[PDB]
Amino acid sequence: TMMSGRPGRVPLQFLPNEARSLPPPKLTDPRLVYMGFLGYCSGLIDNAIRRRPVVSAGLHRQLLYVTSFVFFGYYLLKRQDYMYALRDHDMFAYVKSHPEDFPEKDKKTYGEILEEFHPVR
């Protein structure tokens, strides 16, 4: 468990207060569109299993499938983005705090670096 038990973590909180400072996903996010596509596929499979006309029947039901998937996908994307932002924040802070462990190395050009040449023949 890497980030479980990180200080200041409220248990059973899907989205903390500090996540509000991040850009929310655009409603036309390709990931949101894919969640809607999953909802549509679920609706078609429902019609097929129940032996209704696949594309025509149950338009209200198919709409509910798509809407539920888009809703949950929006909140899932927010939580995923928050966790990744948290990971990057922690990593940058640790690198800043441990300079002796993450030292800046002098850059040498390829005119100074010597590399063995392996001919292909």
Partner: protein
């Protein structure tokens, strides 16, 4: 895995019984109350790895 409903809701379901340095009936002390208190206070807030080291 661990859903800390007790911490979230402010409940106390078994944390009273977890340790022998906690509140006991009639203030009966444990055999190693002072040692356990010292160890808990030392290891508070630094995690398992640093606490063991």
């Amino acid at each position: 895995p661990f859903f800390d409903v007790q911490k979230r809701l402010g409940l106390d379901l078994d944390r009273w019984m977890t340790i022998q340095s906690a509140e006991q009936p009639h203030k009966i002390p444990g055999r190693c109350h002072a040692f356990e208190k010292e160890w808990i206070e030392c290891a508070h807030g630094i995690g398992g790895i640093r606490a063991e080291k």
